[PDB]
Amino acid sequence: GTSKLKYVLQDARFFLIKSNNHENVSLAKAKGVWSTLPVNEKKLNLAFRSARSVILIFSVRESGKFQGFARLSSESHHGGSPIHWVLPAGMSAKMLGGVFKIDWICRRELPFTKSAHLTNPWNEHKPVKIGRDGQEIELECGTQLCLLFPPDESIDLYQVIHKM
Ligand SMILES: CNc1nc(Cl)nc2c1ncn2Cc1cccc(Cl)c1
């Protein structure tokens, strides 16, 4: 069902994550971690303290799709396993310092064609697929977007609810 999912999304905050390549999203799904640039890292740390759930919605640039969504389980933390991110052009490993732990809620894809009816008030009511890395998505838009993804029956949200 969708009842536990709706409970996790209650009063959540949502952020669009834009990755330049598929390898980093695959790594994030395997290891339960994400790293972003310092401007977005500061925003996510503030949001994590402010809301019962902070949801990252992932899209690989040029894929025409979202690749899933996950809930922050921690603020960013430095020191340890230099996650073997595949660095794009103007990207250092010091920029991707700061590792958040995340719990995946859905690892299934959603094509942009399915979200064309959803606009984001925090980005001028442009279609929710449009936005820079770190763009916040308003509650109602974000909730509806997450509910469009195919159910991921491999995930049990019982443990996620207990983190809350
Ligand atoms: C593991 N984290 C990330 N991995 C990848 Cl491949 N792209 C990311 C990531 N975070 C933001 N972006 C998009 C981007 C923003 C500004 C400059 C560049 Cl070159 C790319």
From Swiss-Prot:
Changing W85A: Abolishes binding to N6-methyladenosine (m6A)-containing RNAs. Abolishes binding to m6A-containing mRNAs. One of its GO terms (molecular function) is mRNA binding. Changing F66D: Abolishes RNA-binding and ability to influence alternative splice site selection. It comes from the Eukaryota. GO terms for cellular component: nuclear speck; nucleoplasm; nucleus; plasma membrane. The chain holds residues 345 to 507 of 727 of the full protein. Regulator of alternative splicing that specifically recognizes and binds N6-methyladenosine (m6A)-containing RNAs. M6A is a modification present at internal sites of mRNAs and some non-coding RNAs and plays a role in the efficiency of mRNA splicing, processing and stability. Acts as a key regulator of exon-inclusion or exon-skipping during alternative splicing via interaction with mRNA splicing factors SRSF3 and SRSF10. GO terms for biological process: dosage compensation by inactivation of X chromosome; in utero embryonic development; mRNA alternative polyadenylation; mRNA export from nucleus; mRNA splice site recognition; mRNA splicing, via spliceosome; post-transcriptional regulation of gene expression; primary follicle stage. The YTH domain mediates RNA-binding. This is YTH domain-containing protein 1. Tyrosine phosphorylated. Changing L56E: Does not affect ability to influence alternative splice site selection. Signal peptide: none annotated. Residues 12-149 form the YTH domain. The modification Phosphoserine is found at S81, S92. It is found in: Nucleus; Nucleus speckle. Changing F58D: Does not affect ability to influence alternative splice site selection. RNA binds at K18, S19, N20, W34, S35, W85, D133. Changing N123D: Does not affect ability to influence alternative splice site selection. Changing W104D: Does not affect ability to influence alternative splice site selection. The gene is YTHDC1. Changing R132A: Reduced binding affinity for N6-methyladenosine (m6A)-containing RNAs by 100-fold. Keywords: Isopeptide bond, mRNA processing, mRNA splicing, Nucleus, Phosphoprotein, RNA-binding, Ubl conjugation. Interacts with SRSF1. Interacts with SRSF2. Interacts with SRSF3. Interacts with SRSF7. Interacts with SRSF10. Interacts with CPSF6. Interacts with KHDRBS1/SAM68. Interacts with TRA2B. Interacts with KHDRBS3. Interacts with EMD. Interacts with RBMX. Interacts with ZCCHC8.
